[PDB]
A paper describes a structure:
TFIIIC is a six-subunit protein complex of ∼0.5 MDa mass consisting of two subcomplexes of similar size, τA and τB, which contact A-box and B-box promoter elements, respectively. We therefore structurally characterized the [name] TFIIIC [name]/Sfc7 subcomplex and present crystal structures of two structural modules. The N-terminal moiety of [name] ([name]-NT) and subunit Sfc7 heterodimerize through a triple β-barrel fold most similar to the dimerization domains of general transcription factor TFIIF [name]/[name], whereas the C-terminal DNA-binding domain of [name] ([name]-[name]) comprises a winged-helix domain most similar to the winged-helix domain present in TFIIF [name] that is packed against a second domain with novel fold.
The crystal structure of the C-terminal domain of [name] ([name]-[name], residues 186–396) was solved at 1.45 Å resolution by MAD using selenomethionine-substituted protein. The second domain (residues 284–396) consists of five α-helices and two β-strands and adopts a novel fold with no significant similarity to any known structure. Structural comparison using program DALI identifies the winged-helix domain of [name] (29) as the structure with the closest similarity to the winged-helix domain of [name] (Z-score = 6.1, rmsd61CA = 2.7 Å) among the many winged-helix domains present in the PDB database. The basic interaction surface of [name]-[name] shows two separate positively charged patches.
Author numbering: 190 to 296, 303 to 390
Write the structure that this text describes.
């Protein structure tokens, strides 16, 4: 057991400290905890994949034991599959729109970045701040955030959120097959009115 505390969007208050069952970690895990601390200062919400890509690769399978000392895990909602530092509630801070996670249920590079062009991505959960694709990123940079964090779409208006999701999904369909997305094909999704 790693003693990770999990949350969903209905939780009254987010976790503020580690699971009571956790004791003091080995020096081996403490090293990973020390590496994680500044990463959580830089960015309060992270997927496992994004963290691994910022960590010494020898920490790969110690990471799951270290995270519960600093963070809790969303198991659904707009922050699904992200670890959030204790005491930070992304439902209360619209700046957390940048850290929302989009999961894709689809069938290579280990990157956490969504560029729209790198073939055979293995990642299936992308955070907004890691979307560099210049045709998709402006859609979420420019949009007026909602006045409340929605249970599914978080800080993003539904029609804009699902346009972005559809664009990403279409590009992934192709990238995972070893094909470049068709600009003209994708442009139909991009130019569609928002539902």
């Amino acid at each position: 057991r790693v003693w990770i505390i999990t949350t969903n969007m209905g939780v009254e208050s987010v976790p503020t400290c580690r699971h009571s069952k956790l004791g003091e970690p080995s020096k081996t895990i403490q090293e990973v905890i020390e590496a994680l601390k500044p990463l959580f200062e830089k960015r309060p919400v992270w997927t496992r994949r994004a963290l691994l890509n910022h960590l010494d690769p020898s920490y790969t399978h110690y990471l799951k034991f270290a995270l519960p000392y600093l963070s809790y895990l969303w198991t659904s909602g707009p922050f699904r599959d992200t670890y959030t530092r204790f005491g930070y509630d992304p439902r209360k801070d619209s700046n957390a729109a940048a850290y929302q996670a989009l999961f894709f249920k689809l069938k290579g590079t280990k990157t956490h970045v969504f560029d729209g062009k790198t073939l055979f991505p293995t990642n299936r959960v992308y955070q907004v701040c890691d979307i560099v694709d210049p045709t998709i990123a402006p859609l979420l940079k420019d949009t007026q955030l909602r006045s409340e964090c929605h249970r599914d779409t978080g800080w993003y208006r539904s029609g804009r959120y699902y346009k972005v999701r559809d664009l990403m999904r279409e590009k992934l369909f192709a990238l995972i097959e070893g094909e470049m997305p068709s600009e003209v094909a994708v442009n139909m999704i991009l130019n569609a009115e928002e539902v």
